[PDB]
Amino acid sequence: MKVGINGFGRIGRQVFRILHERGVEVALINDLTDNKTLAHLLKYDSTYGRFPGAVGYDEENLYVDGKAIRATAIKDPREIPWKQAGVGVVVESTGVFTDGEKARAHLEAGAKKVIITAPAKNEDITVVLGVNHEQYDPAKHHILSNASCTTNSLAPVMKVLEKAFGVEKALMTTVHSYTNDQRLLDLPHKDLRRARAAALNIIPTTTGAAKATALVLPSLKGRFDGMALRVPTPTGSISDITALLKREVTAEEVNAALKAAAEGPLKGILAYTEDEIVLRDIVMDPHSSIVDGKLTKAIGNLVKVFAWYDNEWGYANRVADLVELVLKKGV
Amino acid sequence: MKVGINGFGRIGRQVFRILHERGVEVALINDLTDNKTLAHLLKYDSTYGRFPGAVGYDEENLYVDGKAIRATAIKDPREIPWKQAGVGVVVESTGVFTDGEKARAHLEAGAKKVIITAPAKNEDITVVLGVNHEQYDPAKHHILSNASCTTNSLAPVMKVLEKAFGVEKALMTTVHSYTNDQRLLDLPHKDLRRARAAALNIIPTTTGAAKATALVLPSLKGRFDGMALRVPTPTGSISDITALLKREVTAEEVNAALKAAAEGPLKGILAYTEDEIVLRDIVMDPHSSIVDGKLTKAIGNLVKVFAWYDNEWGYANRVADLVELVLKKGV
Amino acid sequence: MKVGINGFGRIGRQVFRILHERGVEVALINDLTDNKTLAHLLKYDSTYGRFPGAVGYDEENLYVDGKAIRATAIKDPREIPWKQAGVGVVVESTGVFTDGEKARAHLEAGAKKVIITAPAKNEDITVVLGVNHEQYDPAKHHILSNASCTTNSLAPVMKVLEKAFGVEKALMTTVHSYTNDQRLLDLPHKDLRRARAAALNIIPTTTGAAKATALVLPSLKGRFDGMALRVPTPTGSISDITALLKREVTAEEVNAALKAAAEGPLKGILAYTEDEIVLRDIVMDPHSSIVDGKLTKAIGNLVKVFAWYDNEWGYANRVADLVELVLKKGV
Amino acid sequence: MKVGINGFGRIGRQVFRILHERGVEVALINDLTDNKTLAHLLKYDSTYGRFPGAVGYDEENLYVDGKAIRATAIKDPREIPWKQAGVGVVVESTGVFTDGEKARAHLEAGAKKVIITAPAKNEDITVVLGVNHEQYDPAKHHILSNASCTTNSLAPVMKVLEKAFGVEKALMTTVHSYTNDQRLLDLPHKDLRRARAAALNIIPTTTGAAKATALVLPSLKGRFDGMALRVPTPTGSISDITALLKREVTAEEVNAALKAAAEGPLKGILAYTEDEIVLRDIVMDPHSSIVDGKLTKAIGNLVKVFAWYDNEWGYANRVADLVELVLKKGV
Numbered sequence A, B, C, D: 001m002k003v004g005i006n007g008f009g010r011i012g013r014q015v016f017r018i019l020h021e022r023g024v025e026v027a028l029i030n031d032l033t034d035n036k037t038l039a040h041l042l043k044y045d046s047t048y049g050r051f052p053g054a055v056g057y058d059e060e061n062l063y064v065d066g067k068a069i070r071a072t073a074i075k076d077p078r079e080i081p082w083k084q085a086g087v088g089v090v091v092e093s094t095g096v097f098t099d100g101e102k103a104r105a106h107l108e109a110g111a112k113k114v115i116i117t118a119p120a121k122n123e124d125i126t127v128v129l130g131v132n133h134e135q136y137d138p139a140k141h142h143i144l145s146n147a148s149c150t151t152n153s154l155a156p157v158m159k160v161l162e163k164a165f166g167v168e169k170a171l172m173t174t175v176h177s178y179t180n181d182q183r184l185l186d187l188p189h190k191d192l193r194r195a196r197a198a199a200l201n202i203i204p205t206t207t208g209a210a211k212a213t214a215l216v217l218p219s220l221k222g223r224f225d226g227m228a229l230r231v232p233t234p235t236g237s238i239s240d241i242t243a244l245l246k247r248e249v250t251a252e253e254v255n256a257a258l259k260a261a262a263e264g265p266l267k268g269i270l271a272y273t274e275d276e277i278v279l280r281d282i283v284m285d286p287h288s289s290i291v292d293g294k295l296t297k298a299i300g301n302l303v304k305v306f307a308w309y310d311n312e313w314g315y316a317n318r319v320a321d322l323v324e325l326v327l328k329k330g331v
């Protein structure tokens, strides 16, 4: 019962480091490049620095302080040796198999459990650690999704605002660091905005993060939606939640409430703070959501809350977190 | 009856170019640097390119295609020769005399009318062209304020949402390009966030833009507030308006309504569009507010509207616009 | 005898606009995206602004102020209808057919002349307008290359330093804006440096620009090489030329010499200036090389010269310039 | 015999952290802001992260894990209580007292030794650890300078190229991250280039780093000069050294030579590497100079060498390093 990663990219590599630093052992790693490039990308990372440990590689492996790890370049899921490596849980992070209909291929090649690191489709269950994980059935579920980084920042907040003040309606905006899914200079893209130079523009882009948060929380079904603004930053994001509660409240109420959750039930997932912070202050923070108290606004029953989150490292800690759970309640 | 500029900086220089390209003649220009540096900053601009025309200078002047303009380096308002230059209307844009209590000094030195390009204090009237300009009394008013770039983007929108759907409550967020008021690297500032590296961070900062918009529109008094997020872009900004109307509406209603205003009463100030645009698409757009139709969201009576605006050039067109009005109804 | 473009990207689109604004008519445009995306990329450009004119499109065309232009999505050269469109000269700018061995396919499908906008291989002649264009034989040549933007900035300089002071040896460095060939965040690349986040790093990368300049100028064969440093800027570049002359000279000599060429023989290609400029000052400058006089250094016979150049617009003016020549001396 | 810092800015704060993590105790810290802002800038740093330890403050002090440190806001050197605090060695890093003629004021107020963290004037001795530190006379010297970050990167290299191949002439170029000395948007500056938007432009600026390196190494007197190019990066820089040796050599010779020095005599100051690195890979590297082997070029006796260096952290390690030496051989 070992882990495997398909899509050793931005998310893959972060999840790997976390799993490493936790003890979990990754048996195989598949991507589309030669193990040389994989070793160099793991070793030197532009956002989180050098890999804590020794990195080596040959035609068929990668070595992490000696321990070998199979590294393949198979672009067809069904053709990945998850079998002859004993890989049970797979972290599908290529961003191209976001639907069980296709990601099932990992099972019909060995794997016993598959975690899609992105908003999936036709999966067994989309889970947001801290919102609906206890709702995982090892018998029934086998193809999971860890939702999206935005969903993971919204959910812990919408949950607390529900079991305290109740939520009628909510619109949200997220100012998000760019990702490899955008373009460096104007170039073809299916989204005519993500096609524009990413480090030059503030780019408006759709996000199902909100509606998706309406599934892990049926409470907000059809009554929660949002927008996204890609901005010139390599990592780090903030969610702008504007929700109409079910009773007039004050910004100070809202906070002590989210603060409560932070230091109690949602501990480790949600965090609360009143410090004068900026983006670079939350980069590499494990949490899913970090509430900026001082920004909390409240005009009667119409509240506005802000939640910082590192769309890369934080999300990756949840993905690795999910692999632990799946392994603890394996099949 | 000629114009004068105090604070030949980012805003000053843009207002100058506009006034030039319109025919208006600036008699004197005061700042804190030698006329050499002034000539070089006007000539070569990093955002709007080279100055359309010939730029020269000597110990006492600047020359724009020959025509001389007095250029002084007097840091004390009362000591600026607005008198011996016949300067009637002054554009106070140093960002340091934002209150008539101090900006009055321009009058007790010559000037007959003073326009503060920023949220003023103790001024005669803060005006937002297209919202409450017809309310200018040349007899009573003499020290005006053109509000702020954010106010000028919000007002034209809040106005339309009032005379159509009525507004109960509204919270707004603005993702704003950085300004010379922030820091390049971490450095001392009265705001512990604007103190952080501006091209590196997404920086949360307070904005009275909303409450200020509650003055040009008493309708929203005490029921409109917002936040600001400084992001790594040199110019261009977007306002995120989340307002609770007085009746359930649809995003398509909201648009055709703002669109109406755009092509009618608020023409020239407000613009509406459905094109797939990004930040660099609105840089140097004269308008005060440009509605991004496609981003318009509506869950019943809770709406979310986005308005692009070039906090520099657009605002500067309003400032120059205000100088025309003041000159047309001079004293 | 009409023009055609294959690879309607960064360079393609700029060459198109130039050809348009010059009168030249492009008959067909091939790329890998739907004509919708092509129309949107031409219309709104993040660096050079909106396209001067009306842009429309349908399943089979693009319309520029009415005039229709065939727009296909054929990824196989031999399969492009250069025939049934009467396209004589083709601008191969996809960056994937940089060798006549493959780019010849444009001929065996219609075209009578092919211009490769990049360092080619197996081409008939690599030309650098102003250095060796008069050496074009319409009878023999049919597959040309316009070299590279770096080559086009170096050549006009190395030429002048040869026919004046003679050149023994020269090493050069270019600080170049990033290009679509690099990555937004760490990601797989054949060059383990261009694989790193482009807007975050200063990235060292090999450049054959120098050795290539040794072909258009056999004088420097085996005695000229250089390096390239990709830096966080979307467009604009500077070449750092360090050459050991054949006689001790002074910085003032070097300048008046390059200045001479600028205002004389190399006019229109090379420019000379002593103004205090920065990058944003040369963006969209047609020239191939713009000498920054004030930076000129000289310790005896070891000189250092700097040349600004807009790797996009300037190069594109040379590409369009080359299409004129090819058309003037067509086949 | 305790240390003191005047100018708790970018350099000051880094030197403080290093001195802290080394055990050295700073007695007093003077700047121009309230101890609140000082505590917040030390605590949260945009480039090097959170301060390793607890940070507190009151009207008269700062607390580092309890231990109190006097924090004043005296803009006049002679008026700093270096006396009633027993501060012997002062780190003058305000960037405004770069000449003993003025920095002497620290002595006539208490201090027994003053280190100017920048190219000084009228100082007793400018030292570059690893080049000419053993040449420090505690009896004669009392006002030192640690040179500049560029000087500290060049010197260790020029030294090795002298005691191996000899150096006839050398021109150098440095691509340097911006600093608080530049501007965020176009704004008045004595240097008409550093006046332009720093995160938007590649900015050419003079540097005495080379001539300065000609003092710590009289060998290159009048035969070494260079240029500087400020680029859009918050920290990290690379030096481009083009030197004409006294004998034809090969790039492989040059390297093994610099490599030798790196692992031997210049260990800890100079480093050598052949790894495929980019800027973000050297941020926070203690070294003064890190040679990028792979970039080494050599055409006979004309060589080109590149040296990475973190103009902030590395230089700060040298400054702290110098305070140790001064304390070990105190007065």
Ligand SMILES: NC(=O)c1ccc[n+]([C@@H]2O[C@H](COP(=O)([O-])OP(=O)(O)OC[C@H]3O[C@@H](n4cnc5c(N)ncnc54)[C@H](O)[C@@H]3O)[C@@H](O)[C@H]2O)c1
Pocket: A006, A007, A008, A009, A010, A011, A012, A030, A031, A032, A074, A075, A076, A093, A094, A095, A096, A098, A117, A118, A147, A148, A149, A179, A180, A181, A311, A312, A315, C187, C188
């Ligand atoms: N970037 C974020 O902050 C973030 C947050 C949450 C979820 N996600 C999701 O995680 C996924 C990966 O995101 P990323 O940021 O790492 O992007 P990425 O570009 O770094 O892609 C990951 C890796 O997948 C590899 N890949 C592509 N096709 C493949 C195939 N057929 N087989 C094997 N490997 C393949 C790519 O070469 C790349 O190295 C996406 O679906 C994304 O939406 C990203």
Ligand SMILES: NC(=O)c1ccc[n+]([C@@H]2O[C@H](COP(=O)([O-])OP(=O)(O)OC[C@H]3O[C@@H](n4cnc5c(N)ncnc54)[C@H](O)[C@@H]3O)[C@@H](O)[C@H]2O)c1
Pocket: B006, B007, B008, B009, B010, B011, B012, B030, B031, B032, B074, B075, B076, B093, B094, B095, B096, B098, B117, B118, B147, B148, B149, B179, B180, B181, B311, B312, B315, D187, D188
């Ligand atoms: N930046 C924007 O987008 C924007 C939009 C709306 C309003 N404003 C307001 O306009 C004002 C100026 O803004 P800016 O962006 O041009 O900033 P800026 O830094 O460019 O300042 C303008 C100029 O004022 C000069 N100055 C300072 N003190 C002076 C004095 N005592 N006498 C004469 N000149 C003096 C400065 O040297 C500078 O050149 C501010 O109050 C600002 O809040 C700015």
Ligand SMILES: NC(=O)c1ccc[n+]([C@@H]2O[C@H](COP(=O)([O-])OP(=O)(O)OC[C@H]3O[C@@H](n4cnc5c(N)ncnc54)[C@H](O)[C@@H]3O)[C@@H](O)[C@H]2O)c1
Pocket: A187, A188, C006, C007, C008, C009, C010, C011, C012, C030, C031, C032, C074, C075, C076, C093, C094, C095, C096, C098, C117, C118, C147, C148, C149, C179, C180, C181, C311, C312, C315
């Ligand atoms: N960027 C510069 O400054 C510059 C300067 C000089 C020369 N060049 C060269 O010009 C070429 C294009 O450069 P670019 O900057 O426009 O990059 P780009 O990414 O914008 O590529 C140009 C276009 O080619 C298209 N394309 C790719 N494969 C294709 C195919 N098989 N058929 C049709 N279209 C295809 C791409 O989709 C893209 O839209 C490269 O070879 C480059 O090295 C670039």
Ligand SMILES: NC(=O)c1ccc[n+]([C@@H]2O[C@H](COP(=O)([O-])OP(=O)(O)OC[C@H]3O[C@@H](n4cnc5c(N)ncnc54)[C@H](O)[C@@H]3O)[C@@H](O)[C@H]2O)c1
Pocket: B187, B188, D006, D007, D008, D009, D010, D011, D012, D030, D031, D032, D074, D075, D076, D093, D094, D095, D096, D098, D117, D118, D147, D148, D149, D179, D180, D181, D311, D312, D315
């Ligand atoms: N930035 C670098 O990489 C670097 C490298 C080597 C040397 N240096 C030199 O170190 C010095 C400081 O550089 P920096 O990058 O920290 O810049 P900085 O802007 O951060 O300035 C340092 C601090 O000095 C303070 N200061 C200014 N005048 C003062 C006064 N009269 N009394 C007390 N404090 C005062 C400023 O408020 C600031 O907080 C400069 O001379 C610089 O040239 C900088």
